[PDB]
C-alpha cells in the first residue's frame, strides 16, 4: 500500500494508475513474486510533432528536437511526448541563458499534430523605488519609501 | 485532530489544482463521490 | 420526449449471435508514416482517453 501510494504521488502526471499484484511461485514454499503494472494517460492518436514560434532557435535545433521525440506508434500515444518536447526546449533556452523564453502551450490535437507554440518575452517597463531602513530592536525591519 | 489532516489529504487527492488547470485539453479529471454500485437496471437512462 | 421501451427484438440481416461488424462509422484512420502538415478533414474530437 505504501509503495502504491508513493508511486502514485511522485509520478502523478505521467501515470494514471499503478497496480501491484502478488503471485505464488510455489504453493508450499510460500515465496511470492510481486508484479507492478503501470497504466499512463494516453492520447487516442498522435502522428507528427511540430514547433511553432521560437524565432531565436536555429532550424538545426528545431530538426534535432523533432527527430528526438518521434513517436513509435500512431495509436494510444502517452502524454509523455509533449512533456519531453517541452523539457528539451526549456533546457535549450535555459542553457542559452534566457530564462523567460518558455513553451507557451500545445495545439494541433484536433488534426493529431502535436505543435508546441513557443512564446518569447522582451523587457517592456523599468521602474525605480527608493527605500530607507530604520534601526530598532523589534527584530522586524521597517522601511520608509521616498 | 486527525480529521483535519484527513481532510487536507482528501483535498490533495481530489482537488489537485495542477490537473484541473489542464484537464480539458490533455486529461480527464471530474468531481465524483465514491462508487455506490457496479450494475444497474438497463432502463435507468429514462431518468435523463 | 417519447419514452424508450426495452423489449428484446428478433434477428434481422444477421443471425442472432453476431452484430454488424462491417458497418461504416465516420472516424478518421491514422497512417503510421508521419505527415508533417496535412489536415485530417475530420477532427478526432475528444483526444484523451
Swiss-Prot record, chain B:
Disulfide bonds: none
Location(s), subcellular: Plastid, Chloroplast membrane
Role of this protein: Essential for cell growth. May be involved in binding chloroplast DNA to either the chloroplast envelope or the thylakoid membrane.
Family listed: Belongs to the ycf78 family.
Protein name stated in the entry: Uncharacterized membrane protein ycf78
Organism expressing this protein natively: Chlamydomonas reinhardtii (Chlamydomonas smithii)
Gene it is expressed from: ycf78
